[PDB]
Design an enzyme around this catalytic site. Structure first.
Site, mmCIF file in Angstrom:
data_model
loop_
_atom_site.group_PDB
_atom_site.id
_atom_site.type_symbol
_atom_site.label_atom_id
_atom_site.label_comp_id
_atom_site.label_asym_id
_atom_site.label_seq_id
_atom_site.Cartn_x
_atom_site.Cartn_y
_atom_site.Cartn_z
ATOM 1 N N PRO A 35 -61.466 32.075 2.881
ATOM 2 C CA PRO A 35 -61.402 33.441 2.895
ATOM 3 C C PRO A 35 -60.261 34.103 3.675
ATOM 4 O O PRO A 35 -59.802 33.451 4.745
ATOM 5 C CB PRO A 35 -62.926 33.685 3.838
ATOM 6 C CG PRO A 35 -63.277 32.586 4.531
ATOM 7 C CD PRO A 35 -62.471 31.278 3.615
ATOM 8 N N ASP A 36 -59.934 35.321 3.325
ATOM 9 C CA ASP A 36 -58.687 36.150 3.880
ATOM 10 C C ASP A 36 -59.402 37.076 4.851
ATOM 11 O O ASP A 36 -60.690 36.771 5.261
ATOM 12 C CB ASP A 36 -57.969 36.720 2.966
ATOM 13 C CG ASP A 36 -58.706 37.800 1.841
ATOM 14 O OD1 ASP A 36 -59.756 37.987 2.363
ATOM 15 O OD2 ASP A 36 -58.216 38.160 0.886
ATOM 16 N N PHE A 37 -58.648 37.983 5.327
ATOM 17 C CA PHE A 37 -59.143 39.173 6.227
ATOM 18 C C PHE A 37 -59.726 40.382 5.374
ATOM 19 O O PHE A 37 -60.599 40.869 5.466
ATOM 20 C CB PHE A 37 -58.117 39.734 6.993
ATOM 21 C CG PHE A 37 -57.849 39.012 8.256
ATOM 22 C CD1 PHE A 37 -58.397 37.689 8.708
ATOM 23 C CD2 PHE A 37 -57.233 39.497 9.476
ATOM 24 C CE1 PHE A 37 -58.389 37.350 9.849
ATOM 25 C CE2 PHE A 37 -56.952 38.869 10.573
ATOM 26 C CZ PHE A 37 -57.397 37.662 10.715
ATOM 27 N N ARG A 38 -58.938 40.762 4.265
ATOM 28 C CA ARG A 38 -59.264 42.013 3.570
ATOM 29 C C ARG A 38 -59.832 42.144 2.207
ATOM 30 O O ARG A 38 -59.970 43.078 1.735
ATOM 31 C CB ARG A 38 -57.856 42.742 3.625
ATOM 32 C CG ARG A 38 -57.432 43.154 5.088
ATOM 33 C CD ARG A 38 -56.288 43.862 4.973
ATOM 34 N NE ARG A 38 -55.787 44.451 6.345
ATOM 35 C CZ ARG A 38 -55.400 43.933 7.436
ATOM 36 N NH1 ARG A 38 -55.278 42.520 7.283
ATOM 37 N NH2 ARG A 38 -55.218 44.518 8.550
ATOM 38 N N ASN A 109 -49.744 31.961 6.175
ATOM 39 C CA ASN A 109 -51.123 31.032 6.157
ATOM 40 C C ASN A 109 -50.863 30.017 7.228
ATOM 41 O O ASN A 109 -49.840 29.250 7.580
ATOM 42 C CB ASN A 109 -51.430 30.673 4.742
ATOM 43 C CG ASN A 109 -51.762 31.488 3.813
ATOM 44 O OD1 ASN A 109 -51.643 32.676 4.180
ATOM 45 N ND2 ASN A 109 -51.693 31.199 2.461
ATOM 46 N N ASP A 111 -53.555 27.306 6.898
ATOM 47 C CA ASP A 111 -54.029 26.335 6.362
ATOM 48 C C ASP A 111 -53.370 24.934 5.783
ATOM 49 O O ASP A 111 -53.895 23.966 5.572
ATOM 50 C CB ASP A 111 -54.993 27.014 4.834
ATOM 51 C CG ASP A 111 -53.960 27.746 4.027
ATOM 52 O OD1 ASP A 111 -52.542 26.846 3.780
ATOM 53 O OD2 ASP A 111 -54.351 28.607 3.440
ATOM 54 N N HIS A 128 -46.297 31.784 11.090
ATOM 55 C CA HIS A 128 -47.361 31.771 12.019
ATOM 56 C C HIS A 128 -48.214 30.830 12.478
ATOM 57 O O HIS A 128 -49.320 30.620 13.110
ATOM 58 C CB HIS A 128 -48.476 32.837 11.552
ATOM 59 C CG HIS A 128 -47.930 34.169 11.438
ATOM 60 N ND1 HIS A 128 -48.735 35.458 10.799
ATOM 61 C CD2 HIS A 128 -46.879 34.872 11.757
ATOM 62 C CE1 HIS A 128 -48.374 36.574 10.989
ATOM 63 N NE2 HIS A 128 -46.779 36.255 11.380
#
Ligand code: CL
Ligand code: ZN
Length: 274
Positions: A35-38, A109, A111, A128
């Protein structure tokens, strides 16, 4: 002059574009199940309750983290290597590297699916941060990611063997500096003769403003659910939007490039090892 997706493929095919820089975010891994944020409905903006968060960004903020590290470490446990696999978007970037076109892939990402897809670390900027390594929040001792794995998988907050401080994975939180490799952008962005942007809202800086750092003659191709960021407010004449599902966009480009069968063989081989 007003470029189409087919024009960009022809620039690659004619070798007018030899040095592609790529900027990606969470939307390239939602097809892998992360899942992303938006995104409506499945994005963290709609699922705060499950992580016990007041809002989605708190999971990457130090004050909230020190107050309650558990939500972050739930995510760490979900994203630790082994759980998710790269999807067609990642293998397209891999193929782009194998075909001699990737100058550099800048990702937001965490991940680690870019590396798992086989893109060499030298071609990647994990802007990040990464779970591959961790740092005591108190004494700053560094640790291999492996060292805290048992605790992460057992829902125990990892602690430093020297000072008992919380050991935090090297994910860049808000307010923190991006890694030193991020400075490759100073030479990478003027050298690029093509920018690809995939699956991001461009809402975090200084990553987002990098879309502005390519020469005004360089096409910027976005493949994303919607028009976003500096592309939506400062559109340039050679910008191309391929709006819709990221993998469907990638598939249309890959077929225009002539790479479809090679891409499918690649995906078949790679996902099956894993
Ligand atoms: Cl660093
Ligand atoms: Zn320590």
């Amino acid at each position: 002059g007003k470029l189409s997706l087919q024009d960009v493929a022809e620039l690659i095919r004619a070798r007018a574009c030899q040095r592609v820089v790529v900027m990606v975010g969470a939307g390239i891994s939602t097809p892998s199940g992360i899942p992303d944020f938006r995104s409506p409905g499945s994005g963290l903006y709609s699922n705060l309750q499950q992580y016990d968060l007041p809002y989605p960004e708190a999971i990457f903020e130090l004050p909230f983290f020190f107050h309650n590290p558990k939500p972050f470490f739930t995510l760490a446990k979900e994203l630790y290597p082994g759980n998710y696999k790269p999807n067609v978007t990642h293998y397209f970037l891999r193929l782009l590297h194998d075909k001699g076109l990737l100058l550099r892939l800048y990702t937001q990402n965490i991940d680690g699916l870019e590396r798992v897809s086989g893109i060499p670390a030298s071609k990647l900027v994990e802007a990040h941060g990464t779970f591959a390594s961790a740092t005591c929040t108190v004494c700053q001792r560094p640790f291999p990611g492996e060292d805290i794995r048992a605790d992460v998988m057992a829902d125990r907050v990892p602690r430093c063997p020297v000072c008992t401080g919380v050991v935090k994975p090297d994910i860049v939180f808000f307010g923190e500096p991006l890694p030193q490799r991020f400075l490759l952008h100073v030479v990478d962005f003027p050298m690029a003769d093509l920018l690809l942007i995939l699956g991001t809202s461009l809402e975090v800086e200084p990553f987002a403003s990098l879309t502005e750092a390519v020469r005004s003659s360089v096409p910027r191709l976005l493949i994303n659910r919607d028009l976003v960021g500096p592309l939506a407010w400062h559109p340039r004449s050679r910008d191309v939007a391929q709006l819709g599902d990221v993998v469907h966009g990638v598939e249309s480009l890959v077929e225009l490039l002539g790479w479809t069968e090679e891409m499918r063989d690649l995906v078949q081989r790679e996902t099956g090892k894993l």
